[PDB]
Amino acid sequence: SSQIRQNYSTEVEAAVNRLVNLYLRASYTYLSLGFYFDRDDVALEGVCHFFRELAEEKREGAERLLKMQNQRGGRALFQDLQKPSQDEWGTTLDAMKAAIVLEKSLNQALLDLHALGSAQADPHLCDFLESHFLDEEVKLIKKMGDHLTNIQRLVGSQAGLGEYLFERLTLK
Amino acid sequence: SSQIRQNYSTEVEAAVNRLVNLYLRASYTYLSLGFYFDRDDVALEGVCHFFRELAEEKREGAERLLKMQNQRGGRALFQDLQKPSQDEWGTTLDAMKAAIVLEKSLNQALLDLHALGSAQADPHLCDFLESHFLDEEVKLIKKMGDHLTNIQRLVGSQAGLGEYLFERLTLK
Amino acid sequence: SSQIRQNYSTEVEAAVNRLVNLYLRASYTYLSLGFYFDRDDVALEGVCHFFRELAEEKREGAERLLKMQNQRGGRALFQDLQKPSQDEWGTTLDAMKAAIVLEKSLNQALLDLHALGSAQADPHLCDFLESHFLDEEVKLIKKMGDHLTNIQRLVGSQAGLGEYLFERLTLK
Amino acid sequence: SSQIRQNYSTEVEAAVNRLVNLYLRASYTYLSLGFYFDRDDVALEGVCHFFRELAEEKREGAERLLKMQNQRGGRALFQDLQKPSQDEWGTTLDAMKAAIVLEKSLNQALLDLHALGSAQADPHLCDFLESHFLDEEVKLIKKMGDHLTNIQRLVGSQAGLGEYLFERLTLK
Ligand SMILES: [Ir+4]
Ligand SMILES: [Ir+4]
Ligand SMILES: [Ir+4]
Ligand SMILES: [Ir+4]
Ligand SMILES: [Ir+4]
Ligand SMILES: [Ir+4]
Ligand SMILES: [Ir+4]
Ligand SMILES: [Ir+4]
Ligand SMILES: [Ir+4]
Ligand SMILES: [Ir+4]
Ligand SMILES: [Ir+4]
Ligand SMILES: [Ir+4]
Ligand SMILES: [Ir+4]
Ligand SMILES: [Ir+4]
Ligand SMILES: [Ir+4]
Ligand SMILES: [Ir+4]
Ligand SMILES: [Ir+4]
Ligand SMILES: [Ir+4]
Ligand SMILES: [Ir+4]
Ligand SMILES: [Ir+4]
Ligand SMILES: [Ir+4]
Ligand SMILES: [Ir+4]
Ligand SMILES: [Ir+4]
Ligand SMILES: [Ir+4]
Ligand SMILES: [Pd+2]
Ligand SMILES: [Pd+2]
Ligand SMILES: [Pd+2]
Ligand SMILES: [Pd+2]
């Protein structure tokens, strides 16, 4: 058992384990999104690469959370990783919408953990969440929103042309 | 009080102070234009960056004017900076039109000061205005007109597509 | 309208817009302070340069605030920028006193926004304010206080000599 | 005789020759000022060097005027160079006052030639005077005024100390 654990509640420890599962689930979702856009009948490599890099970011998020759990003397517990919500992701517009929904859900979970850690008087936790996750989520969600606006502007008329152009001129 | 002031009328001194306020107002306008195009629901970063760089140019214009006022022994006097004319700027076409209107107004003010300094026999002033402001305004207004023509050509049919393309292929 | 806004109250959004106006007003104040010390009858270039660099810092502060407002999905709204409180700034002592008063007012506004964001449960805001504004204001105000103490020590007897010396040996 | 002279009046030609004599006289004045501050009983080497460099500037001004006179097909005519107005120049304050009086007189002569060339419709002349003389005189006279203000501030009490300090900390 730990000899280091201090000011680290069992409620926070569990919530950290839930958040690890959420980040890993999000990484898996992004893996599926990435490979969908690599299908020969979809073939938007800029979209594939955008989602694959998000898969990596989310996995790294989970790993940072796991290192933090061990730094505080908590115990990592892993659960089943639920398969992604869809097997086919539609258009780049549909996929970007799905991505923002996913990210807002991760953000809301961070906010819920921060609130819990406030109620627990755990400032190391508040700080850790702030500096490596909350600012990153805000920045990511702004980029996604920007992309969604550009996609929408493009696929008002001539949807195929607009999807190609966004991929070619925004995504790489 | 000054020991250096020579051939520098109180009328020119006041007009220089009015022009400083106009350049600063124009810088503020461009700040507002820039951030509007950075909204998640507008999201034209090439447009944001074009206007932000104009904000900087106009501030530098005012600073050069203030240094000149002190070089001649005049006294800088600052007034309220009126907020920009709009809170939302519409399309890139609308914004570019607003920009050219603004720049033509600055130009006309430079021309009016040059006329005043003629009537005052103040060639240092004529020279200073010419070399650091009048040629720059002519060049800037030509670039704006060029941009307006390209935007107009693009948004005749398929306005969203054309706005995206101008941003991507002209503005960066 | 925004597709990204999350946990970002209308009260915080408005307070951020007020703070942008305060930073810009402070930048304008510093512009006026800087050019006053560049008058031929004042002629303290170290003082001019100290205030001009603060003008730049305050403008950058406002720009960071505006980028943050857009990152959260809030809407920038600009108001009239009130001219500075004085047209002539007296001695370097008077000016430094004015500067510290100004900075303490900006600081108090940051503290008031941080309190609001506490009451709103907005940790992204707390973090953003902390890391890019609160530590900077504390450091700046300490430097100003140090300068004020040195000026005061100098202008106890032989005020002209002391003002020259501070400018020459502290300010550059 | 010239085969090139065009739009270059005998009135302008004579005024250019008078201005050459004024620049050379000013160079001579600065030579005398420089060596005075190099006396063992004055011994302000920063002041010596400031005036010696102005002697060089004024000679170069005259040489540019002479090259211009030949470029337009006018004929250089030289007159007696009147010795400087004083043989001893007093304090650094007295000398700086004398310098600004001298420079304002050169400036006024440039302005008078510019007016003449206006009345003569000679824009090459206006341009030449503007770009190589009028802006330089304005900049020089502002630096002199700044220096005068600093000297005055220093020699309010403890005149010897203040003169030493200005020389050491402003002039090199
Ligand atoms: Ir990449
Ligand atoms: Ir890559
Ligand atoms: Ir990449
Ligand atoms: Ir917290
Ligand atoms: Ir941490
Ligand atoms: Ir590109
Ligand atoms: Ir390419
Ligand atoms: Ir650029
Ligand atoms: Ir750039
Ligand atoms: Ir740029
Ligand atoms: Ir003119
Ligand atoms: Ir100039
Ligand atoms: Ir500096
Ligand atoms: Ir500097
Ligand atoms: Ir600096
Ligand atoms: Ir807080
Ligand atoms: Ir931030
Ligand atoms: Ir030198
Ligand atoms: Ir030298
Ligand atoms: Ir030198
Ligand atoms: Ir002229
Ligand atoms: Ir010339
Ligand atoms: Ir120095
Ligand atoms: Ir030295
Ligand atoms: Pd890829
Ligand atoms: Pd930008
Ligand atoms: Pd400066
Ligand atoms: Pd020398």
PDB file of C-alpha atoms in Angstrom, chain D residues 44-172:
ATOM      1  CA  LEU D  44      34.715  68.719 -21.080  1.00  0.00           C
ATOM      2  CA  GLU D  45      35.652  66.151 -23.733  1.00  0.00           C
ATOM      3  CA  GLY D  46      32.078  65.006 -24.352  1.00  0.00           C
ATOM      4  CA  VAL D  47      31.202  68.652 -25.244  1.00  0.00           C
ATOM      5  CA  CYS D  48      34.318  68.974 -27.427  1.00  0.00           C
ATOM      6  CA  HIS D  49      33.355  65.857 -29.325  1.00  0.00           C
ATOM      7  CA  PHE D  50      29.619  66.881 -29.724  1.00  0.00           C
ATOM      8  CA  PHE D  51      30.707  70.192 -31.351  1.00  0.00           C
ATOM      9  CA  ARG D  52      33.419  68.721 -33.464  1.00  0.00           C
ATOM     10  CA  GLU D  53      30.991  66.239 -34.946  1.00  0.00           C
ATOM     11  CA  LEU D  54      28.591  69.174 -35.696  1.00  0.00           C
ATOM     12  CA  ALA D  55      31.484  70.996 -37.465  1.00  0.00           C
ATOM     13  CA  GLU D  56      31.763  67.934 -39.731  1.00  0.00           C
ATOM     14  CA  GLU D  57      28.007  67.798 -40.352  1.00  0.00           C
ATOM     15  CA  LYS D  58      27.878  71.450 -41.355  1.00  0.00           C
ATOM     16  CA  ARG D  59      30.858  71.096 -43.720  1.00  0.00           C
ATOM     17  CA  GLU D  60      29.184  68.094 -45.313  1.00  0.00           C
ATOM     18  CA  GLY D  61      25.969  70.200 -45.669  1.00  0.00           C
ATOM     19  CA  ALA D  62      27.952  72.843 -47.574  1.00  0.00           C
ATOM     20  CA  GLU D  63      29.615  70.251 -49.814  1.00  0.00           C
ATOM     21  CA  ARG D  64      26.170  68.774 -50.721  1.00  0.00           C
ATOM     22  CA  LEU D  65      24.980  72.241 -51.570  1.00  0.00           C
ATOM     23  CA  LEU D  66      28.012  72.816 -53.789  1.00  0.00           C
ATOM     24  CA  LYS D  67      27.533  69.493 -55.588  1.00  0.00           C
ATOM     25  CA  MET D  68      23.883  70.438 -56.136  1.00  0.00           C
ATOM     26  CA  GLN D  69      24.812  73.872 -57.500  1.00  0.00           C
ATOM     27  CA  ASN D  70      27.061  72.179 -60.071  1.00  0.00           C
ATOM     28  CA  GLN D  71      24.409  69.514 -60.852  1.00  0.00           C
ATOM     29  CA  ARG D  72      22.012  72.346 -61.861  1.00  0.00           C
ATOM     30  CA  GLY D  73      24.620  74.315 -63.826  1.00  0.00           C
ATOM     31  CA  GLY D  74      24.976  77.129 -61.360  1.00  0.00           C
ATOM     32  CA  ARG D  75      28.304  78.560 -60.437  1.00  0.00           C
ATOM     33  CA  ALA D  76      29.815  78.289 -56.949  1.00  0.00           C
ATOM     34  CA  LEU D  77      31.074  81.609 -55.594  1.00  0.00           C
ATOM     35  CA  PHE D  78      32.794  81.778 -52.318  1.00  0.00           C
ATOM     36  CA  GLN D  79      32.954  84.684 -49.893  1.00  0.00           C
ATOM     37  CA  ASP D  80      35.193  85.716 -46.810  1.00  0.00           C
ATOM     38  CA  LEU D  81      34.150  83.244 -43.843  1.00  0.00           C
ATOM     39  CA  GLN D  82      33.439  85.572 -40.907  1.00  0.00           C
ATOM     40  CA  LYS D  83      35.145  84.423 -37.684  1.00  0.00           C
ATOM     41  CA  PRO D  84      32.809  83.059 -34.998  1.00  0.00           C
ATOM     42  CA  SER D  85      30.864  85.433 -32.794  1.00  0.00           C
ATOM     43  CA  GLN D  86      32.855  84.674 -29.631  1.00  0.00           C
ATOM     44  CA  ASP D  87      36.365  83.676 -28.706  1.00  0.00           C
ATOM     45  CA  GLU D  88      35.309  82.046 -25.346  1.00  0.00           C
ATOM     46  CA  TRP D  89      32.002  80.208 -25.036  1.00  0.00           C
ATOM     47  CA  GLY D  90      31.251  80.150 -21.322  1.00  0.00           C
ATOM     48  CA  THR D  91      29.492  77.137 -19.881  1.00  0.00           C
ATOM     49  CA  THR D  92      28.035  74.146 -21.572  1.00  0.00           C
ATOM     50  CA  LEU D  93      24.619  75.898 -21.102  1.00  0.00           C
ATOM     51  CA  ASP D  94      25.862  79.062 -22.836  1.00  0.00           C
ATOM     52  CA  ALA D  95      27.357  77.050 -25.654  1.00  0.00           C
ATOM     53  CA  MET D  96      24.236  74.942 -26.192  1.00  0.00           C
ATOM     54  CA  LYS D  97      22.104  78.140 -26.343  1.00  0.00           C
ATOM     55  CA  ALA D  98      24.529  79.558 -28.959  1.00  0.00           C
ATOM     56  CA  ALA D  99      24.254  76.338 -30.927  1.00  0.00           C
ATOM     57  CA  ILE D 100      20.496  76.358 -31.018  1.00  0.00           C
ATOM     58  CA  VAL D 101      20.476  80.050 -32.100  1.00  0.00           C
ATOM     59  CA  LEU D 102      22.908  79.096 -34.907  1.00  0.00           C
ATOM     60  CA  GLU D 103      20.877  76.137 -36.032  1.00  0.00           C
ATOM     61  CA  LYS D 104      17.589  78.088 -35.989  1.00  0.00           C
ATOM     62  CA  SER D 105      19.321  80.654 -38.224  1.00  0.00           C
ATOM     63  CA  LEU D 106      20.367  77.931 -40.684  1.00  0.00           C
ATOM     64  CA  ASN D 107      16.878  76.529 -40.602  1.00  0.00           C
ATOM     65  CA  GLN D 108      15.331  79.930 -41.304  1.00  0.00           C
ATOM     66  CA  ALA D 109      17.696  80.304 -44.270  1.00  0.00           C
ATOM     67  CA  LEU D 110      16.591  76.914 -45.640  1.00  0.00           C
ATOM     68  CA  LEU D 111      12.977  77.986 -45.217  1.00  0.00           C
ATOM     69  CA  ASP D 112      13.699  81.232 -47.002  1.00  0.00           C
ATOM     70  CA  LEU D 113      15.311  79.347 -49.956  1.00  0.00           C
ATOM     71  CA  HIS D 114      12.411  76.931 -50.114  1.00  0.00           C
ATOM     72  CA  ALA D 115      10.010  79.904 -50.331  1.00  0.00           C
ATOM     73  CA  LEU D 116      12.077  81.527 -53.095  1.00  0.00           C
ATOM     74  CA  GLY D 117      12.109  78.169 -55.043  1.00  0.00           C
ATOM     75  CA  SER D 118       8.293  77.920 -54.603  1.00  0.00           C
ATOM     76  CA  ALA D 119       7.947  81.492 -56.133  1.00  0.00           C
ATOM     77  CA  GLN D 120      10.435  80.284 -58.856  1.00  0.00           C
ATOM     78  CA  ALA D 121       8.522  76.900 -59.531  1.00  0.00           C
ATOM     79  CA  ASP D 122      11.651  74.886 -58.838  1.00  0.00           C
ATOM     80  CA  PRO D 123      10.587  71.546 -57.352  1.00  0.00           C
ATOM     81  CA  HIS D 124      13.964  69.855 -57.721  1.00  0.00           C
ATOM     82  CA  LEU D 125      15.260  72.510 -55.302  1.00  0.00           C
ATOM     83  CA  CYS D 126      12.281  72.038 -52.817  1.00  0.00           C
ATOM     84  CA  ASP D 127      12.892  68.279 -52.811  1.00  0.00           C
ATOM     85  CA  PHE D 128      16.688  68.507 -52.400  1.00  0.00           C
ATOM     86  CA  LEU D 129      16.313  70.979 -49.469  1.00  0.00           C
ATOM     87  CA  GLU D 130      13.640  68.873 -47.806  1.00  0.00           C
ATOM     88  CA  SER D 131      15.277  65.469 -47.861  1.00  0.00           C
ATOM     89  CA  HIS D 132      18.900  66.311 -46.985  1.00  0.00           C
ATOM     90  CA  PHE D 133      18.524  69.523 -44.840  1.00  0.00           C
ATOM     91  CA  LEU D 134      15.106  70.444 -43.432  1.00  0.00           C
ATOM     92  CA  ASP D 135      14.456  67.048 -41.665  1.00  0.00           C
ATOM     93  CA  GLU D 136      18.039  66.990 -40.395  1.00  0.00           C
ATOM     94  CA  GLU D 137      17.743  70.486 -38.973  1.00  0.00           C
ATOM     95  CA  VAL D 138      14.464  69.637 -37.242  1.00  0.00           C
ATOM     96  CA  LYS D 139      15.987  66.487 -35.705  1.00  0.00           C
ATOM     97  CA  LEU D 140      19.161  68.326 -34.659  1.00  0.00           C
ATOM     98  CA  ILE D 141      17.350  71.242 -33.080  1.00  0.00           C
ATOM     99  CA  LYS D 142      15.096  68.780 -31.077  1.00  0.00           C
ATOM    100  CA  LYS D 143      18.261  67.035 -29.739  1.00  0.00           C
ATOM    101  CA  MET D 144      19.692  70.417 -28.804  1.00  0.00           C
ATOM    102  CA  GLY D 145      16.591  71.461 -27.081  1.00  0.00           C
ATOM    103  CA  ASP D 146      16.525  68.157 -25.124  1.00  0.00           C
ATOM    104  CA  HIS D 147      20.175  68.773 -24.104  1.00  0.00           C
ATOM    105  CA  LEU D 148      19.384  72.341 -23.033  1.00  0.00           C
ATOM    106  CA  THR D 149      16.541  71.155 -20.829  1.00  0.00           C
ATOM    107  CA  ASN D 150      18.843  68.567 -19.192  1.00  0.00           C
ATOM    108  CA  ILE D 151      21.616  71.033 -18.659  1.00  0.00           C
ATOM    109  CA  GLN D 152      19.203  73.536 -17.125  1.00  0.00           C
ATOM    110  CA  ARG D 153      17.787  70.946 -14.832  1.00  0.00           C
ATOM    111  CA  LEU D 154      21.338  70.141 -13.676  1.00  0.00           C
ATOM    112  CA  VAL D 155      22.789  73.490 -13.003  1.00  0.00           C
ATOM    113  CA  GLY D 156      19.956  74.890 -10.913  1.00  0.00           C
ATOM    114  CA  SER D 157      21.967  74.076  -7.772  1.00  0.00           C
ATOM    115  CA  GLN D 158      25.638  72.849  -7.814  1.00  0.00           C
ATOM    116  CA  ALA D 159      26.496  74.101 -11.336  1.00  0.00           C
ATOM    117  CA  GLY D 160      30.000  72.439 -11.544  1.00  0.00           C
ATOM    118  CA  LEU D 161      28.649  69.060 -10.527  1.00  0.00           C
ATOM    119  CA  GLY D 162      25.783  69.304 -12.996  1.00  0.00           C
ATOM    120  CA  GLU D 163      28.057  70.249 -15.923  1.00  0.00           C
ATOM    121  CA  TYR D 164      30.319  67.278 -15.188  1.00  0.00           C
ATOM    122  CA  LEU D 165      27.451  64.911 -14.920  1.00  0.00           C
ATOM    123  CA  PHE D 166      25.804  65.966 -18.187  1.00  0.00           C
ATOM    124  CA  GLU D 167      29.121  65.594 -19.989  1.00  0.00           C
ATOM    125  CA  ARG D 168      29.812  62.171 -18.507  1.00  0.00           C
ATOM    126  CA  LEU D 169      26.308  60.612 -18.697  1.00  0.00           C
ATOM    127  CA  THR D 170      24.696  62.269 -21.730  1.00  0.00           C
ATOM    128  CA  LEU D 171      27.541  63.265 -24.017  1.00  0.00           C
ATOM    129  CA  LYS D 172      29.452  59.954 -23.955  1.00  0.00           C
TER     130      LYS D 172
END
